[PDB]
Amino acid sequence: XXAXXAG
Amino acid sequence: SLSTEATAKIVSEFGRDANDTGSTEVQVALLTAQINHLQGHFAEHKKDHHSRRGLLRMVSQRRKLLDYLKRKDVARYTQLIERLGLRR
Amino acid sequence: VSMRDMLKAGVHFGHQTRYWNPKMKPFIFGARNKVHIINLEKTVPMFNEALAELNKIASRKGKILFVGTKRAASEAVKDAALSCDQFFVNHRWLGGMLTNWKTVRQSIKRLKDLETQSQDGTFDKLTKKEALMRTRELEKLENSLGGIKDMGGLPDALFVIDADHEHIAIKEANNLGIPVFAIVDTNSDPDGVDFVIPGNDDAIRAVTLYLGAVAATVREGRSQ
Amino acid sequence: SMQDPIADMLTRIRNGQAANKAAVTMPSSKLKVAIANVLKEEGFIEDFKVEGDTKPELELTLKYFQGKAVVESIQRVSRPGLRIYKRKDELPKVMAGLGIAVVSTSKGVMTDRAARQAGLGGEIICYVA
RNA sequence: GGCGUAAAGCGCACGCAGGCGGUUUGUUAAGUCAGAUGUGAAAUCCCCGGGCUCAACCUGGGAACUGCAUCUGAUACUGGCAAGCUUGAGUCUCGUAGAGGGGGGUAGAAUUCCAGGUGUAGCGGUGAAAUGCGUAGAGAUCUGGAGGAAUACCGGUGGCGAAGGCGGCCCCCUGGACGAAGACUGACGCUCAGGUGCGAAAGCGUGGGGAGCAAACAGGAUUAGAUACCCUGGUAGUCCACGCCGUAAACGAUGUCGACUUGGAGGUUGUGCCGGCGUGGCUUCCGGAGCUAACGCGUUAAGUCGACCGCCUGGGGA
RNA sequence: AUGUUGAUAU
Ligand SMILES: [K+]
Ligand SMILES: [Mg+2]
Ligand SMILES: [Mg+2]
Ligand SMILES: [Mg+2]
Ligand SMILES: [Mg+2]
Ligand SMILES: [Mg+2]
Ligand SMILES: [Mg+2]
Ligand SMILES: [Mg+2]
Ligand SMILES: [Mg+2]
Ligand SMILES: [Mg+2]
Ligand SMILES: [Mg+2]
Ligand SMILES: [Mg+2]
Ligand SMILES: [Mg+2]
Ligand SMILES: [Mg+2]
Ligand SMILES: [Mg+2]
Ligand SMILES: [Mg+2]
Ligand SMILES: [Mg+2]
Ligand SMILES: [Mg+2]
Ligand SMILES: [Mg+2]
Ligand SMILES: [Mg+2]
Ligand SMILES: [Mg+2]
Ligand SMILES: [Mg+2]
Numbered sequence: 001x002x003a004x005x006a007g
Numbered sequence: 008s009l010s011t012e013a014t015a016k017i018v019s020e021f022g023r024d025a026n027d028t029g030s031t032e033v034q035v036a037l038l039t040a041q042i043n044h045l046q047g048h049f050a051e052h053k054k055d056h057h058s059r060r061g062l063l064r065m066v067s068q069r070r071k072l073l074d075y076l077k078r079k080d081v082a083r084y085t086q087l088i089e090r091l092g093l094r095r
Numbered sequence: 096v097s098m099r100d101m102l103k104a105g106v107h108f109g110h111q112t113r114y115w116n117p118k119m120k121p122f123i124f125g126a127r128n129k130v131h132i133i134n135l136e137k138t139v140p141m142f143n144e145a146l147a148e149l150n151k152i153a154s155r156k157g158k159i160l161f162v163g164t165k166r167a168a169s170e171a172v173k174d175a176a177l178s179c180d181q182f183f184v185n186h187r188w189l190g191g192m193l194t195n196w197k198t199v200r201q202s203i204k205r206l207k208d209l210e211t212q213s214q215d216g217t218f219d220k221l222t223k224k225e226a227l228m229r230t231r232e233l234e235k236l237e238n239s240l241g242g243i244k245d246m247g248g249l250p251d252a253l254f255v256i257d258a259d260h261e262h263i264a265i266k267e268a269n270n271l272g273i274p275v276f277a278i279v280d281t282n283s284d285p286d287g288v289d290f291v292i293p294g295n296d297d298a299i300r301a302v303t304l305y306l307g308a309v310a311a312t313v314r315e316g317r318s319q
Numbered sequence: 320s321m322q323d324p325i326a327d328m329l330t331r332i333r334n335g336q337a338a339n340k341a342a343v344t345m346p347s348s349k350l351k352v353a354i355a356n357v358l359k360e361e362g363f364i365e366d367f368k369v370e371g372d373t374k375p376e377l378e379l380t381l382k383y384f385q386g387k388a389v390v391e392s393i394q395r396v397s398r399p400g401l402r403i404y405k406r407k408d409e410l411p412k413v414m415a416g417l418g419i420a421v422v423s424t425s426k427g428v429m430t431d432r433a434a435r436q437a438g439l440g441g442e443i444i445c446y447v448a
Numbered sequence: 449g450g451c452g453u454a455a456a457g458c459g460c461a462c463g464c465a466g467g468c469g470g471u472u473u474g475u476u477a478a479g480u481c482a483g484a485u486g487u488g489a490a491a492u493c494c495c496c497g498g499g500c501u502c503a504a505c506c507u508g509g510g511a512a513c514u515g516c517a518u519c520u521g522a523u524a525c526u527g528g529c530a531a532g533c534u535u536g537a538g539u540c541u542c543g544u545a546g547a548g549g550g551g552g553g554u555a556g557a558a559u560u561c562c563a564g565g566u567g568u569a570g571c572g573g574u575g576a577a578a579u580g581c582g583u584a585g586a587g588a589u590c591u592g593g594a595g596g597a598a599u600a601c602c603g604g605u606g607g608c609g610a611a612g613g614c615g616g617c618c619c620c621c622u623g624g625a626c627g628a629a630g631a632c633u634g635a636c637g638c639u640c641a642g643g644u645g646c647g648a649a650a651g652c653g654u655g656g657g658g659a660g661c662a663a664a665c666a667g668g669a670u671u672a673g674a675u676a677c678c679c680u681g682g683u684a685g686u687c688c689a690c691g692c693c694g695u696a697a698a699c700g701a702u703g704u705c706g707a708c709u710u711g712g713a714g715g716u717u718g719u720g721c722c723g724g725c726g727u728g729g730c731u732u733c734c735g736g737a738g739c740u741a742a743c744g745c746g747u748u749a750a751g752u753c754g755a756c757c758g759c760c761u762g763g764g765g766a
Numbered sequence: 767a768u769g770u771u772g773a774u775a776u
Binding site for chain 5: 008011014015019022024026027028029030031033034037038045047048049051052053054055056057058059060061062063064066067068070071072074075076078079
């Protein structure tokens with residue numbers, strides 16, 4: 001998830 | 008297996024000589040003796056499947072020798088199956 | 096060469112039968128005490144025609160190269176080569192001595208440069224340690240490239256003790272189409288070798304016999 | 320079981336050549352001997368000889384030239400699983416005539432050269448080259 | 449053209465049809481081969497020409513139509529028929545090793561439970577715990593008893609079996625393999641679609657049995673959660689009889705049979721000659737040529753060949 | 767003991 005990454 | 012004595016009796020009965028062990032008639036007669044002997048074993052030992060594979064080899068071998076004898080000499084075949092008491 | 100010399104020298108003794116190469120079946124007489132006996136009746140004729148062609152190459156002013164790096168057969172090979180005025184490799188064969196001669200040539204020049212430096216008294220100029228390095232650097236180059244320092248190019252034939260042990264030299268000699276003459280014991284493979292000499296490669300007494308003969312025949316070639 | 324003795328002879332030669340054997344020994348037969356003649360006459364093998372009465376043994380002596388074996392290839396062509404018969408016009412040239420096809424014609428076993436000359440076709444036994 | 453690992457060897461066998469078939473002689477002439485004759489419409493294609501200004505196009509003659517049939521010969525090979533032969537295959541004699549199979553019996557070690565003695569506060573369990581067990585006396589220790597299941601050591605890249613598989617000891621019934629000497633039969637063989645049989649474990653049916661173990665399940669943990677791994681329990685099942693199922697990475701991921709082609713080191717089981725020297729069977733590891741995309745395989749081939757069968761044809765969908 | 771994950775194209 002997170003509504004779509006790596007930071 | 009068939010005993011030394013019982014083997015020798017069949018060799019004399021079916022052989023042209025006492026030393027004629029090879030003949031198709033002797034071979035077929037010996038197989039028939041052991042196939043008939045083992046009927047008692049497999050009546051008792053229905054799940055002796057490993058031994059039965061040996062029985063069905065004898066049955067097969069005998070069929071091949073009778074099919075040989077028949078086409079080689081029809082009369083010798085007809086005499087043999089009568090004595091031993093085989094359908095074919 | 097004589098056959099009484101061979102059986103005296105112990106040329107007939109091969110390796111244990113378990114260590115044999117099957118391609119040496121033609122040259123093997125039999126087995127005594129689980130050790131292959133080389134047939135000397137094969138050796139002597141084969142060694143004569145080996146000694147014949149070496150003489151022929153010698154007579155054409157050919158550079159013979161005596162390769163044999165086994166501990167026992169080292170100083171034998173150098174004595175035979177120097178007595179004959181020919182070249183040798185009596186310690187570790189450098190991979191690419193012949194096939195990479197263009198490179199190895201440069202390491203000859205170093206051995207030549209260091210010895211000319213040594214005798215001049217160039218080592219006294221540098222500060223002890225620097226000279227002691229050069230002393231050690233000369234020493235290692237003498238061991239490796241000492242026998243072929245004056246060779247000047249590729250040799251005209253190889254003479255080899257132990258075809259298995261010196262398989263790299265032979266494979267290089269095959270690569271460049273240089274004739275290989277070799278002592279081939281029962282454990283060894285004769286296929287690279289151009290003139291097989293079925294014999295005991297191990298014993299010093301056997302080694303001296305072969306080397307003495309090739310030394311003689313090549314020296315006799317250089318005479319005539 | 321053994322069901323092609325000719326293929327077996329060709330294979331004994333092929334293998335024997337590869338193994339640098341001097342001679343190869345098979346059980347003999349008339350047809351094997353007939354082939355051995357054609358291989359002798361065309362110069363692929365050196366010699367042969369039958370030995371025995373009850374069980375005859377053919378024994379081909381093999382040729383090597385400059386180290387190499389002389390029989391470069393030797394292929395069964397007609398075989399029990401598929402018989403090949405050719406008419407005179409359609410006889411095979413092995414290696415553009417540099418090798419032979421052994422042909423069983425009505426006038427005995429012979430090369431495809433000899434069969435062309437005799438005007439016969441027949442069963443193509445093998446190629447040799 | 450492929451099928452050890454890329455897709456591909458049926459799990460294994462027996463075997464009918466079929467395919468294939470050691471060696472010698474004769475015979476036949478079906479296959480096969482040779483020749484001849486008839487036919488193979490014309491056009492088309494092809495070749496050498498001719499005609500339209502050229503070409504396309506048109507057209508003369510040939511060649512071709514690889515085929516089919518008939519007749520007459522050839523007889524090596526294949527087939528048929530007849531008679532052989534012993535080398536393939538099989539029979540007999542004597543012996544050898546074996547967890548080969550089926551049936552019955554029995555032994556010792558251990559677990560669990562039951563009863564009782566001694567004894568007293570823990571036991572058990574884990575990474576750490578807790579659930580659990582225990583003063584109603586556990587755990588530990590000793591005695592006696594019951595019952596089921598499996599057979600330590602021997603034990604071995606040991607053995608046996610078609611494969612699946614088979615392990616205490618004893619007996620009964622029984623299959624195969626191997627070796628040595630001959631003698632005997634005389635190709636009786638190989639392979640095998642369909643067919644038939646056997647086929648681990650799990651599972652199913654009926655009736656037994658049930659110590660230990662353990663899907664499910666329950667509880668305790670762990671964790672963000674933990675429908676898991678760990679812990680405490682625990683039912684089917686695992687065991688027996690009979691029947692069914694018919695599948696497994698049922699594997700050497702390698703079909704069966706036969707022949708041939710350098711070596712080395714073992715294991716196991718016969719045997720001959722006198723600890724050595726041979727010679728058979730089965731088997732483990734390495735490796736040569738050769739083979740292979742390579743890895744590797746390598747006389748137990750994945751090398752060199754023959755016979756027959758099975759199977760593959762991009763990934764997915766399946 | 768346990769001990770998850772890393773948007774699309776390039
Ligand atoms: K998520
Ligand atoms: Mg029997
Ligand atoms: Mg392909
Ligand atoms: Mg795969
Ligand atoms: Mg695959
Ligand atoms: Mg298989
Ligand atoms: Mg079968
Ligand atoms: Mg035949
Ligand atoms: Mg005909
Ligand atoms: Mg014109
Ligand atoms: Mg025309
Ligand atoms: Mg026409
Ligand atoms: Mg015939
Ligand atoms: Mg089937
Ligand atoms: Mg079960
Ligand atoms: Mg049940
Ligand atoms: Mg029940
Ligand atoms: Mg549990
Ligand atoms: Mg399957
Ligand atoms: Mg498989
Ligand atoms: Mg290997
Ligand atoms: Mg991740």
